[PDB]
Design a protein around this ligand. Sequence first.
Ligand SMILES: Nc1ccn([C@@H]2O[C@H](COP(=O)(O)OP(=O)(O)OP(=O)(O)O)[C@@H](O)[C@H]2O)c(=O)n1
Ligand SMILES: Nc1ccn([C@@H]2O[C@H](COP(=O)(O)OP(=O)(O)OP(=O)(O)O)[C@@H](O)[C@H]2O)c(=O)n1
Ligand SMILES: Nc1ccn([C@@H]2O[C@H](COP(=O)(O)OP(=O)(O)OP(=O)(O)O)[C@@H](O)[C@H]2O)c(=O)n1
Ligand SMILES: Nc1ccn([C@@H]2O[C@H](COP(=O)(O)OP(=O)(O)OP(=O)(O)O)[C@@H](O)[C@H]2O)c(=O)n1
Ligand SMILES: Nc1ncnc2c1ncn2[C@@H]1O[C@H](COP(=O)(O)OP(=O)(O)O)[C@@H](O)[C@H]1O
Ligand SMILES: Nc1ncnc2c1ncn2[C@@H]1O[C@H](COP(=O)(O)OP(=O)(O)O)[C@@H](O)[C@H]1O
Ligand SMILES: Nc1ncnc2c1ncn2[C@@H]1O[C@H](COP(=O)(O)OP(=O)(O)O)[C@@H](O)[C@H]1O
Lengths: 534, 534, 534
Amino acid sequence: MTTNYIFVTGGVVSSLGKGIAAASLAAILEARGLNVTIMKLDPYINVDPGTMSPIQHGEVFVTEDGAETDLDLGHYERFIRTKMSRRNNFTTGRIYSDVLRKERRGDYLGATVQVIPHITNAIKERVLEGGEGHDVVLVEIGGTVGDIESLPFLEAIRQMAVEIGREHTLFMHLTLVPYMAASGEVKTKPTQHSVKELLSIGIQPDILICRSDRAVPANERAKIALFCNVPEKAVISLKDVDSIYKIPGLLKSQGLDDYICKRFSLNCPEANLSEWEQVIFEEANPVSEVTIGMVGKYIELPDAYKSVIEALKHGGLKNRVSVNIKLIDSQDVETRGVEILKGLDAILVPGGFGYRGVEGMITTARFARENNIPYLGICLGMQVALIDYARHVANMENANSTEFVPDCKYPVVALITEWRDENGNVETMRLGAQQCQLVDDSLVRQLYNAPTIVERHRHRYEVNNMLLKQIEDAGLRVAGRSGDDQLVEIIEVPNHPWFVACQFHPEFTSTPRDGHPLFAGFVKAASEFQKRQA
Amino acid sequence: MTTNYIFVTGGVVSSLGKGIAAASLAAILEARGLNVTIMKLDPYINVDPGTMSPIQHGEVFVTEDGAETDLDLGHYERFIRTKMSRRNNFTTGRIYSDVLRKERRGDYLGATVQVIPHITNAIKERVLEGGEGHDVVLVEIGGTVGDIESLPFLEAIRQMAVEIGREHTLFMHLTLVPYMAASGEVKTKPTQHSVKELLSIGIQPDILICRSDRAVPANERAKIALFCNVPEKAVISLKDVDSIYKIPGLLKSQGLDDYICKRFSLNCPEANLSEWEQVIFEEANPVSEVTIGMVGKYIELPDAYKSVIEALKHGGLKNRVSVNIKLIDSQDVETRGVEILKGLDAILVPGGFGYRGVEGMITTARFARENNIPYLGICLGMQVALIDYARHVANMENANSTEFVPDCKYPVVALITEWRDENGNVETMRLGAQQCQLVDDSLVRQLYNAPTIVERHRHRYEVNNMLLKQIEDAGLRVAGRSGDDQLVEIIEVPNHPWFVACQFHPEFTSTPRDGHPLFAGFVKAASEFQKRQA
Amino acid sequence: MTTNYIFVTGGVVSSLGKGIAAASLAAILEARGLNVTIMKLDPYINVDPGTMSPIQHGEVFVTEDGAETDLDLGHYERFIRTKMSRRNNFTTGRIYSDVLRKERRGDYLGATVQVIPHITNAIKERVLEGGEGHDVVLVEIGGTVGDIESLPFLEAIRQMAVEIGREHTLFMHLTLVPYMAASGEVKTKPTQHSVKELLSIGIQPDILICRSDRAVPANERAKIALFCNVPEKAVISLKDVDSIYKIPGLLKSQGLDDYICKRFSLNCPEANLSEWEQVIFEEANPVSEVTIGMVGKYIELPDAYKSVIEALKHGGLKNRVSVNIKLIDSQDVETRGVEILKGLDAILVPGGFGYRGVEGMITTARFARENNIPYLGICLGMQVALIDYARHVANMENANSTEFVPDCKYPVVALITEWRDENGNVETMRLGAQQCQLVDDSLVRQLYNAPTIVERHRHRYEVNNMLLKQIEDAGLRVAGRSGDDQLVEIIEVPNHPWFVACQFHPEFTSTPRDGHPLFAGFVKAASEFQKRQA
Ligand SMILES: Nc1ccn([C@@H]2O[C@H](COP(=O)(O)OP(=O)(O)OP(=O)(O)O)[C@@H](O)[C@H]2O)c(=O)n1
Ligand SMILES: Nc1ccn([C@@H]2O[C@H](COP(=O)(O)OP(=O)(O)OP(=O)(O)O)[C@@H](O)[C@H]2O)c(=O)n1
Ligand SMILES: Nc1ccn([C@@H]2O[C@H](COP(=O)(O)OP(=O)(O)OP(=O)(O)O)[C@@H](O)[C@H]2O)c(=O)n1
Ligand SMILES: Nc1ccn([C@@H]2O[C@H](COP(=O)(O)OP(=O)(O)OP(=O)(O)O)[C@@H](O)[C@H]2O)c(=O)n1
Ligand SMILES: Nc1ncnc2c1ncn2[C@@H]1O[C@H](COP(=O)(O)OP(=O)(O)O)[C@@H](O)[C@H]1O
Ligand SMILES: Nc1ncnc2c1ncn2[C@@H]1O[C@H](COP(=O)(O)OP(=O)(O)O)[C@@H](O)[C@H]1O
Ligand SMILES: Nc1ncnc2c1ncn2[C@@H]1O[C@H](COP(=O)(O)OP(=O)(O)O)[C@@H](O)[C@H]1O
């Protein structure tokens, strides 16, 4: 068994959906019974994505092993079952850190460390590492062709391709075929040049992807084929669609996978894409609709809550109900007030960092709680709900977190070391998939249908056990506790129709085909509430 | 007085309106009191445009001196008051013809004729020729930057920039800043690359034009400025508009011309663009609406009748009336019949070559004539009307042209040598502006308010004369005759509300600022008729 | 049987010997038993090489069919036994002439004639024409890669490579690996860039040729292999040598031809290069040496008499004798005099056009004749010798050619129509291989060992038979005549040790393997005379 590789690049303009295209392909390859995986190389100096804000790049994906990575790794999780790890994604900065460290400790024995060959060695070794044991490995190269930001990666690839032979490698290149309404037609010139640019750095494309807002005519595809040294059948058209889940169908329709196995001499079984066909059918034919309001901070760029949005969508798919998300700034609830929260069937509060208008988030939690409006809280949203309940029901005046107000007096959230009571008596970050002991009598235990569950984490401060007993005894159900320290993983409100909040990140496990119990429950409850109010 | 030059190129995609942009600029420069002219260089192997169809490139412009040329030369006539000539436009093939002929004649004295020099020298000399005696010369370079089709021209320019000195030359470049709805924003990367391409061939841009369907944000313009080595003030945005006569206003608004005079140390008085402001006001505020149906052959490509379409527009501007143009295939009138011609206020029959569905054109002429529906005939359309009238009023069954039927037996149209009667008894091409003798008692004489009028021609066959007397005596007014041979230049129908048909091409003389009497009358007649039919 | 093609390009610098390399390869493939042919594409605008001077490009090759062409076609004749024709070489200018003429004739039916696809189609057609019926076709691409002068050709090639299929085409590319004495080593950087340039226009090299003044180290070849996407075995080193006939040996030594047959799936028999080895052996081991003076006009550029020089070399190879050519300006013979002609073993006077030092040429002819010094005259040299003898022996005062003097009074050379005697009584260009009738009793008949011969021509003027009887009867042998009008072809001097002159161009038939009787006799005579004078 020898591993085959396909490289993905893109030119002309960014934001064409390279990760989307790659994931869609991989889904098909899995559907054909092939051991396919995927990695992404990122043109950034940032070593870890954790050093950047949510508004800067959107949500930072949490892998099973706790690694912080590019959002697209979560996208990969939503198309293939191969699990991603720290080996599936790294940056330019990461490379330099490693190489410079090797220099420092004498690993290059007095030699000059150069881009060629030393930086490219770091790269190609990481690629081979991640591709170990797989039939097909997709490698997405971030950045845009022709820009200096990723030329080292492109060079490493060229070298690799030569080393492994053309029989184990294909070049897939995304382009843009823009529509010019003034002329009444699309243009191909930009594409022709994009290809020329790859050629100038030693790369000859095998497969072309023509992104556009409409199907590209065969004639135009032929013209491209001519100028790019590519067979007509290898020029694929890819018009804009209203759902990513429909892309596998399109790629399959144009015979992409057949071509690929032919190129790799693989006797590949016919792709079973019916799993997504089902999803598509259900997606396009919901029986109902429901309005979900979301209160947060990074709503100025939906990418920040992308994983959440997708998870909500998945709940909707399972309940055949359209999910309408209202973006609400916590600072407006703080300013304008709860009037914002009117007209909602259910309310959701996401995680994240920053004090900002969190008091408005608390106000919102209070609102949904007291008005029996289905509620779902995640990470920070749980912290918020905790404060709400504690301060207004358990009478914990100024219930708060030490991360914002160390001298709280009622630090309902604090570092385990920082746990303390209102009298000053006392007694890093949790990451990745961790086992949570669910309370057998809780709803969540029954929603998952299991004694324990395993879910992803990312947070530093915990529920302060010193005061927990006040909150819990006041009438709040701890629906589940972690493990060794029995940390409050998840809570439920005794008499609320559906009020659930947790420490873990269910949004990194939900898929369009499998769904997820908490979103199924939340969204269903949302619909139920809507009907109860009508 | 030293001539200043501005070169205009375009990259990324074609169909940006290089000629339009240049013409709009020239209009401003004229408005600044400057002796501005303009030339266009073509990347075509065809020596003359007369060897190509109108479906291939659209209407072929007829210059005053009889030269056939690129459509855009007419566009230049619609912005400035100078006159285009054969010196204002030439092709790649033209260059080679000349150079190879020089080779043949020994003009290179046994030397190798190379691209550099020789071929580029020919280009340089032609540019200097056309720009002689002008303050500012705009030069439009056909083709797209990065394509081999025009690299020789780009090279010749580079040479001249050095030879002349940068103090007398500027580099203007059009790009595309396309909107990507999927991202919700426009992209600037294509532009960045276009500039890089110019640089690779020795050209550093001075002025950038950002074509798009919407105004480009200052921030994006700044980003471009950075990467292109261009001052922010020289980065001009040009969004799509519904009228080319509004562009001068936009260019003026952004201070383009001020920059230019500054670069050329010119003392330029404030541009008087009120002429077009008037036109715009009138254009955007018509008091009426008429529908004109045009029966022809190349209607699948509006460009083929571009000069005509704009002439109709110009008449409409002066009469403050909206002009609708129905595109009718003569072959359908031939097939389906006159039912096509219903719902029209006026009938238009343009010129051209090809028998095709001319019988449907004749049918149409008959329809308009017989039903008193405001009729306008041009070149061939006149010949069609001649035949119509001849066959049904003068009873010249089978009246036609010898160019289609050698023995019509009623050859109403023929070469002068070919003039003959129905019994076979007998007794090159006319191009450019020619003086016609108008009949003092005709409407057209009064439409121009002059005994004679000079108008452009492009055609080989003439009104027989032998059989003319049958047609004219039957009751048809010859509204004007030519010069030496007093050839039927224009006719009018005695009892038709408005029926004018002529040999000349008024569509190459109308302007947005002046209009043109025949289109003014035609369109007005359409309105009159419209109101009568109510 | 399917034709295979190999394209030969080169970059970095000119003057690498692309034609030499190709010819040497052809010789090997000939030795492998393959049907090999060869063509050269000329980037020049000149339609025919006849419109350029000898000083501009050196000697112009005369093909069998009379076509005038690139000197390298003669070089091809010196490595392969196949025959070149007009189909083996054409220029850029030629292409345009043809295409424009087709345009004029309506061949493109109203379509736009563009470089792509119309100019490239003209090229494509010519290539297929010349390669028709051959196993292997070598195509030399003139010009330098990266220059605009030949991009159209490179594009046509790319297209054909795709349309034909890679299984029938290879890309060979010459570079320069210059020695930098300051560093003490050769550099490869230029090569790396040259390859990148081909890649940017859609061409990926398969075979690399490293031109230098010394063998390139395997390590450096490996470095190149890396950066160019080429197997190490396909990187061929080519150091400078003292004989082009040693190149087949070098290419064979590195396994070039084996690689090629593998790429074309040909079962090629072991090359028999022993014929070349023989030539080399003899070349490197002459038994004697002679000095031959060459009196002419274009001696400032060796290339002008290249074919002659090589013909002399071949005579020397057959007689195992070194040939030392003394270049002499005929104008200096006019100035300095016959002192120039001292110290020579033999005298040679080449053909050409222009008077210049012709009187000095006559003086030289006289000198060699009267002093019994082994003389060989070709074309113009014959004309000169004719005048010499006529004026100084037949007493034809001012014997001359009408091409220089309208009224020579003794026009020994004139157009056939212009033939006349000294009393005024009377009564295009001869090209290609023509049959000549040799006089059985002449030396040259016996040198050739045949009644008749076939030799190439290139001249318009002929021996004026009106005055021939004066010259011939005075005591001069006509060794051969032509055909229909028995035009004088060869002349011998009755009592001169070895003095001959002819109308044809034997230098276009001489080969390194076959030699050529005339030059063998000439050079031999030089030796004989040398010994005679010692
Ligand atoms: N020749 C250059 C110039 C710029 N960049 C890259 O150019 C990109 C800019 O484009 P893009 O990433 O798509 O976003 P913006 O910078 O906002 O600009 P745009 O989208 O128009 O390209 C930056 O990432 C920068 O790294 C580079 O690497 N090499
Ligand atoms: N590297 C190349 C490739 C193409 N062309 C030019 O590319 C042009 C084709 O593009 P364009 O004029 O814009 O129209 P289309 O050929 O229809 O294609 P497109 O508009 O997408 O470029 C042709 O005129 C051809 O001369 C060239 O000169 N150099
Ligand atoms: N970018 C350029 C520059 C030059 N030329 C061509 O370059 C050739 C000249 O180069 P070359 O043959 O190498 O000789 P020279 O010009 O004398 O200079 P050099 O040998 O140093 O290149 C000319 O035919 C000219 O048409 C061209 O096609 N493209
Ligand atoms: N397109 C490429 C290819 C190579 N290199 C640089 O190429 C240099 C190698 O060339 P050079 O420094 O000149 O020395 P060598 O590698 O020995 O090869 P050469 O001198 O022939 O270039 C290396 O430093 C490497 O960083 C690079 O940056 N970009
Ligand atoms: N054909 C498609 N239909 C519509 N939009 C799509 C499609 N494929 C790509 N996209 C869009 O591309 C965007 C991907 O964003 P981003 O993560 O920046 O892409 P990339 O993977 O190229 O970085 C999404 O907004 C997605 O909707
Ligand atoms: N900003 C503008 N608004 C809308 N379209 C415009 C504008 N300026 C340029 N164009 C369009 O450009 C086209 C010009 O066509 P064409 O003659 O092919 O352009 P070019 O001069 O670039 O060859 C027209 O359809 C015209 O409407
Ligand atoms: N390796 C070789 N040894 C020495 N010089 C060579 C060799 N191969 C090529 N040449 C030289 O190349 C030159 C060819 O000249 P020219 O015809 O101008 O080159 P091209 O055909 O590449 O234009 C000759 O002077 C010849 O000696």
